[PDB]
Amino acid sequence: KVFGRCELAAAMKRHGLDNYRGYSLGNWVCAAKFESNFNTQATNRNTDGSTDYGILQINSRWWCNDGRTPGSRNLCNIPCSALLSSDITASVNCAKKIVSDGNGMNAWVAWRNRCKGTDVQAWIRGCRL
Ligand SMILES: NC(=[NH2+])NCCC[C@H](N)C(=O)O
Ligand SMILES: NC(=[NH2+])NCCC[C@H](N)C(=O)O
Ligand SMILES: [Cl-]
Ligand SMILES: [Cl-]
Ligand SMILES: [Cl-]
Ligand SMILES: [Cl-]
User: Fold this and answer.
1) Which of 27, 23, 100 is nearest to 8 (CA)?
2) Could you tell me which cysteines form disulfide bridges?
3) Where are any strands of DSSP class E within the chain?
4) Rounded CA gap, 88 and 107, in Å?
């Protein structure tokens, strides 16, 4: 599923991401924009052989099981495929665990490089939330 901008903001809010660990909804929408262009089915292989999955490009190295990332963990206790569903529940629950992990949203390199410090409120502007 390719979400609309306000559509995703709404879904993220419903699943409790808005201001989770102090990160406003706009941060999460901006992160999803540059990670996946709002596409739940996005996948990208990393140089190390792990793969990033879903709207927030969650990595098999630590967070999900894909059966093909040697030495990896599955800290969200899910198959990586659950992160590609049109229902964003698994991605949000896993993102909550990731952002609690110590480095906040810097865990997402695209957020650090393209969203951090910017006017992230623009991402939810005009949305009936
Ligand atoms: N959120 C991340 N993927 N961070 C990268 C390092 C992972 C971190 N050492 C951990 O607790 O698994
Ligand atoms: N070149 C870019 N990546 N621009 C993204 C900024 C989008 C802007 N915050 C908006 O939603 O209207
Ligand atoms: Cl957009
Ligand atoms: Cl594996
Ligand atoms: Cl599995
Ligand atoms: Cl933080």
Assistant:
1) 27
2) 6-127, 30-115, 64-80, 76-94
3) 43-45, 51-53, 58-59
4) 19
**Sign of the dihedral through C-alpha 4, 114, 20, 64:** positive
Q: Which technique was the structure solved with, according to the deposited record?
A: X-ray
> What tokens appear for 95 in the block?
């993102």
Candidate of 101, 106, 109, 111 to mutate for ligand 1, largest count of ligand atoms within 8 Å of Cβ: 101
Write the CATH number for 9: 1.10.530.10
Residue 34 CA: nearest ligand 2 atom is 3
> Cβ(118)–Cβ(66) under 8 Å?
no
- Testing ligand 1's pocket by substitution, the residue of 62, 80, 100 carrying the most ligand atoms inside 8 A of its CB is 62
Q: Residue 72: CB partners within 8 Å, gap ≥ 6?
A: 50, 60, 61, 62, 65
Residue type at 23 in one-letter notation: Y
How far apart (Å, rounded) are the C-alpha atoms in residues 37 and 31? 9
